[model samples]
Target: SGAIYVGNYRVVNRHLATHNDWANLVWEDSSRDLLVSSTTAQGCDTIARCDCQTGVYYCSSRRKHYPVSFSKPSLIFVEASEYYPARYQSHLMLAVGHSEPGDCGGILRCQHGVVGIVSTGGNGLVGFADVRDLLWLDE
Candidate 1:
């Protein structure tokens, strides 16, 4: 898979949470930086310094951005195409949205800050691994 640099932090690998359905993009930001230039891809948007916080998340399915304030480890159940049993896992967060095949591993942001990363979904509900619950493997 291709990697992208979020400011000085290079998202280089994936970290699957322990016994969880989702994973996080492992980022690297150290004193010794790489000389290679960053990407200027279309969706790269404006250049900004990396912080211990935040995405340019625009939910195409909702036709709006989720700029709301939400606490960590939150959940919302939506009446979608089908029904499923509720899970009490702390490592997962759910959202109601239409997602395509390649939407997995994308950032799930809330008001410019990252809440989770895309893990699994179909039809209506999407599951994400919470950033707080991400396994600190090599982090």
Candidate 2:
């Protein structure tokens, strides 16, 4: 749908892992298919998902840190009943991390339907950012 940028943050001491140990940085969508960007440091990794209909993106990570290590994956959900014409039916974002040992974290906005936001870590912070236009689905 539109172009979205995923800002890079350095991981110093702690290992960053997500979504089954896959930590993705970027994602692109052309038609309905999705393309994801990812990375792996030490053993942790990240992954991003793309939703073409609403133009949303989702990213999740797995970490080695204790107590906060186990983070539940996230999905997309309508934040509110209101809808925007320019924007997708609802805001698309990523949700990772968890509050309790089994609780999920938060949701992060990506683009349109390309991604879905969910809970993550103990603090409940969202994962990934909006980077829709950056992808070429047909390419």
Candidate 3:
């Protein structure tokens, strides 16, 4: 769907990484209140500054400017609210054991870098659309 409203803002464009089952939406207008950064990942070791406050987890490490190849599984870090929150499953998409609603669209990260975007999951689990499969538009 195009030009859909999220909350109150208008989404001007949307791009889907179908293989990963994830997509990114572009807002119709810009605002300093919604500015955020999406950086590349190098490896799990590069994430050295993870911290939590007010129930939110964030990192200040110098994220790599390149994507990673998932040769092996790494500990994924996410800022989400889940039920059980101890188990994870991967089947084309990554699903945390038991996540709640509003968990979709959440960003999943690891030492390697951004792993995926939340696609669908709730009550029992939450799945993610792998960022590795995303096709970035040329700027």
Candidate 4:
């Protein structure tokens, strides 16, 4: 006998904002299978992978100049704060992958009122400050 195959559905919970970019979400299901998905301003894309246990989801703007290379991909994470709305704010933990020389990157946490960046000089240390425009993405 064939095994049971369940269909996918959307459970509306909140009103999320629409941004003009490619955003993906990867999470583990009840069976510990890694699922990869994408979301748009309108809605989510069809479920991609169902059994990817160890992978990361990111929001990235495609590089027009170089289609092969990605502009900058930001890692998406869940935020517990309720001050900011869903669409206007997305809590993300930035990952600087394989840092090269003269790469100074940072994040602007506007809602939380924090500005942070990795210092460019020697002994690269992350510095934080209280400022506006808290989210920063460099492509």
Candidate 5:
């Protein structure tokens, strides 16, 4: 859940979105769709930017702010690795759509992770990740 889980560094892989709704096949190779989406407990790592829609994944867009929250987190955005900082990564990630309303631009959702702002959130709230960056479980 994007909402706080009592207290923690972050929440990851609590809920998994279907590969099709969780990825952006627009820029990435179409073959990526063919790649099976088997992942480990610590899967869905981000090596680069992949926000296609103008939602939480759109980090710079500031769809929300720091110290955010989510009822049920979705999509992988605000990640620290190769993100947040071009050189270093934070202790954990900052999943998107995890913000609460009236947040002064909050985005430090330390208690939850995101799945996808899909039908549960809105229309076309698609997610994207470089298949190359993602580490498949079967890989």
Candidate 6:
């Protein structure tokens, strides 16, 4: 697919402990296999089937934040649809860049259980104005 630039919108990738294993588990199709896989592993909390067809990407999950956090605030931060409480989740995200191939264009974000394929910016195309969140917790 081709690249899609959404004006000034920015995306920040959060990396947690389970980043590697979870990322390795995301199998990429041969650009020929039109399919979606949603499976779980030993320690994997959640895994949403991702299908990056053409340019625009979409993802959905029904899993909610474990016990919920007392955020009492609506920061307008962004991240979707499914079947069951938090079941319906589908995120209309950007593209996965055809050049990266397979899962090369994405990374595993486990912070707050952000489980899915997140693509990094190509050649510094997109960037976060402030990334204090990158230094999350003790990292």
Clashes of 3: 2
| Model 2 segments more than 4 A misplaced | 1-112, 116-121
lDDT of 6 at 125: 22
Q: Which candidate leads in TM-score?
A: 1
| Count of residue pairs whose backbone atoms collide, per candidate | 1, 47, 2, 5, 21, 10
**Model 2 worst lDDT window (10 residues):** 8-17
Residue 103's C-alpha lDDT in candidate 6? 27
User: What is the C-alpha local distance difference test score of each model?
Assistant: 0.38, 0.28, 0.30, 0.21, 0.25, 0.23
Which residue runs of candidate 6 sit more than 4 Å off their true CA positions? 1-35, 38-43, 46-105, 119-121, 125-139
Taking the tens digit of each residue's C-alpha lDDT, what string does model 2 give over 79-125?
32222112222122333333332222222332332232232223554
| Candidate 3 pairs with clashing backbones | 43-111, 44-111
Clashes, model 5: 21
Q: Where does candidate 1 stray beyond 4 Å?
A: 1-90, 133-139
TM-score of each: 0.39, 0.21, 0.33, 0.17, 0.18, 0.21
The best-first sequence of candidates by TM-score reads: 1, 3, 6, 2, 5, 4
Deviation from native of the Cα of residue 31 in model 4, angstroms:
18
Q: Model 4, 1-139: lDDT tens per residue?
A: 0010112211111112113111343221211111223333233222221211112221122111110111122223222324222221221123323322233222222222222222111232211111112111110
Write candidate 5's Cα lDDT for 1-139 as tens digits. Answer: 2211112112122133235424522222222111232222344422222332222432323453333233322233232221122222112223244223222112121222332221112131222222213322113
Question: In model 1, what lDDT does residue 19 have?
Answer: 22
